[PDB]
Symmetry: C3
Subunit: 333 residues, 3 copies
């Protein structure tokens, strides 16, 4: 088919954990969906101690923004590498077929741009990430990854074929960082990317992250940036991990319907407490809130959550249900 | 509904790997099921070398006892923290909805008790664990975790909707411990919990357990404490890991029906050799023994099993089936 | 039944990643399928640096060869330990029932052989590995593992019960090695297996592989030994990991149908980007190629893939489909 005869729609992306507006059920036929992202190398402070790294980002954030299309739409990405950056970059979409997910066709030096198009033939949530030949894990574990959601044209379905419709969606990107340490255990610091590269490789080869964070920093999804919901609201949480396994858990809730490995032609797993998202995968969990208050959303390696950073919060408004849970006798002597 | 109009039944818990008596198919309507647990901080020897730690337990055991109810029963737990303990504790049930699984409502200092009630709205096996704000992984990885089984009211079902009925059930709790080491690699030792806390945090942050054990110690489920069965018996093995992934395997057998992530509204996976239970999850495997002899039940990271402790035994009585397996020619020159 | 009345067929094994000829749909009734393997202890160079280890192999390769039978065939293995080896060995089949998978019946000193028979009662791909009491992880992580495929008698089926027929099959064995290091980080070297044993145990207990490789060495499945396919071909990739989790991914493709934990009575997961194969398991992924070119097949812990060795290639011939993917604007200033 002549792709030039199809509608074109330009998407304006938003910063995670928020997600650009879209329709769950497709209101048009197939479209070419146009996205632009600008690569930004920048310093980021990632913990409460003030540890600052040289991050590599799509569109200025870790993770990169969530892109949303429907099955059999075409994704057309303009990828810009401005001359204020110093490295070569590209992009691999796990949603795409051919050319190493796009990476073989999108190598951009500083000062260059490119436009890639692919057909989104499989529904699900998928990782995307930079992947320059020979330097792949360094770019990925510097923050250069995000996700894309390819919705079925008739939206999501439960294990019986009945519709599932979310009221809110959030995208939680989980990032393992490998900040090199000296023998005494303090984080080093480097003057150029090339001077950093060998100790970055050394640090990665330990297979022991120094930090594991949501939305780019310890505490990013807390306080004034906590996730929010109301009792009775249906929430989809998309979670990705481009390099390392994770095991999400909503403390005080469940995943009512979970696609742990993210692919919507499969029936969801029901009533999960915790789910495994393998490294290199995006998953999605659907929950209807039943109680108000603070929830923690964590990687349930609790060391990874509470020591290394992989924990955020929901603040949920509404009525308390004492049938579902109550303190019969409050703590007392 | 007026919960006061429902029957109350008091359960008397038993020490793992055994499980209190219960009915698979509910013989009554919904009930308030009353449990009591008393927290005990105690020294435990966890390996053959004599390594002794300061464990934190529910009811004196690692893991804490398996609680069993049916879907839409109410769980009413009296949690006691005697004044012979020194720390603050609480409890989070992954089966429950609201207040961080109960933790926000059950904070008990030494000398205090509390009673929590929640409705068990989802069937499955679930973790429970202590979770005091700011000190969560330390309590969990000191042994303060167990599991609860919420049976469907009409018992278990296979992938076709047909009943599955177990003859025996066992609960295997798997515990990762992080005993601090000095530079030479020997385990340290500490005079108070507060003096231990920083090196416990340091040890946890390595993400490398020093010990990974079933039922609280190397070898606990061997010898006179091996699990037992007969040929032809249907056995359910509930397995939990509150903090770290595991991959159970019955050496010489299978999981005929497995809920790897523990939730009974899902069809089981059939004929598994090995299954992944993510950290923060309980799973359950159903097997019908077909051969007598010794079996090993392991985490099939065989280093974790045979070096670090994650191995137990079954001793199975009955007839040998030479059709299923035989030595045609015994080892010989 | 009198096994002596059944047909016998002798299989002649081939070196991975290739697989001996077989029929997907069984063309005969049940058979005794006869295999022979000869254990070989040998030196292997496993990386580009020239690191040489003392490997322990079935039939001279890491992994051992893929064996293929049908459900309810009998597997009859002659296992030979020649007197040129120095250690005791045996074999455990995860496909088998009883005697620790066969290990209790197959202990062979150098200069001995044995013949084991078992009934392959469950369809799926399964690990086999050596397992000498007390030394199990050392033999496994020295390379002494492979896999066996037990096909359903009517071949593979999709999630709807429709046939799935592969045109090509490959077996990728993934091996974690634990080469002991000195304090400075260089690999040691040892003069006998007994002198190596304690530092091998020490190295294993770090839970941090030094190398993670496909088909026995860094780069083994690249260059003149890349995997091959044509556009439109249906390929099954069997992947095993006897000791540690992995997460396979075809870079530029998908797993159209995946049995991540390898057992064919279960419906496959559709459209996977990445899948988790738990340590101690074999899995299988079915894909129909749609684009030509180079693909990388990796463990999608990208550190494990590109630093530690867990990466191979496909070279795929045929026509490029610009509807599915194209460069709209090639990289340019
Ligand atoms: O369930 N909370 O750690
Ligand atoms: O299957 N045993 O390690
Ligand atoms: O998807 N490639 O790393
Ligand atoms: Cu990059
Ligand atoms: Cu990738
Ligand atoms: Cu506690
Ligand atoms: Cu928890
Ligand atoms: Cu061996
Ligand atoms: Cu095994």
């Amino acid at each position: 088919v002549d792709i030039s005869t199809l509608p074109r729609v330009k998407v304006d992306l938003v910063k995670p954990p928020f997600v650009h507006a879209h329709d769950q059920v497709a209101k048009t036929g197939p479209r070419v969906v146009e996205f632009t992202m600008t690569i930004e190398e920048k310093k980021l402070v990632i913990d409460r101690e003030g540890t600052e790294i040289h991050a590599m980002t799509f569109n200025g954030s870790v993770p990169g923004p969530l892109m949303v299309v429907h099955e059999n739409d075409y994704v057309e990405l303009r990828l810009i590498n401005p001359d204020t950056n110093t490295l070569l970059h590209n992009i691999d979409f796990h949603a795409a077929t051919g050319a190493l997910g796009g990476g073989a066709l999108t190598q951009v030096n500083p000062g260059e741009e490119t436009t890639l198009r692919f057909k989104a033939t499989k529904p699900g949530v998928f990782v995307y990430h930079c992947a320059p030949e020979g330097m792949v894990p360094w770019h990925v574990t510097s923050g250069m990854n995000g996700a894309i959601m390819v919705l079925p044209r008739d939206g999501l379905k439960d294990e019986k074929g009945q519709p599932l419709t979310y009221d809110k969606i959030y995208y939680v990107g989980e990032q393992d960082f490998y900040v090199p340490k000296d023998e005494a255990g303090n984080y080093k610091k480097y003057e150029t990317p090339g001077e950093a590269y060998e100790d970055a490789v050394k640090a990665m080869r330990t297979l022991t992250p120094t930090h594991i964070v949501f939305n780019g920093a310890v505490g990013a999804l807390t306080g004034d940036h906590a996730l929010t919901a109301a009792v009775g609201e249906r929430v989809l949480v998309v979670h990705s991990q481009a390099n390392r396994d994770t095991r999400p858990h909503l403390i005080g809730g469940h995943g009512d319907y979970v696609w742990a490995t993210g692919k919507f032609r499969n029936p969801p797993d029901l009533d999960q407490e915790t789910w495994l998202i393998p490294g290199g995968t995006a998953g999605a969990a659907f929950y209807t809130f039943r109680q108000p208050g603070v929830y923690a959303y964590v990687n349930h390696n609790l060391i990874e959550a509470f020591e290394l950073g992989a924990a955020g919060h929901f603040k949920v408004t509404g009525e308390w249900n004492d049938d579902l849970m109550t303190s019969v006798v409050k703590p007392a002597s």
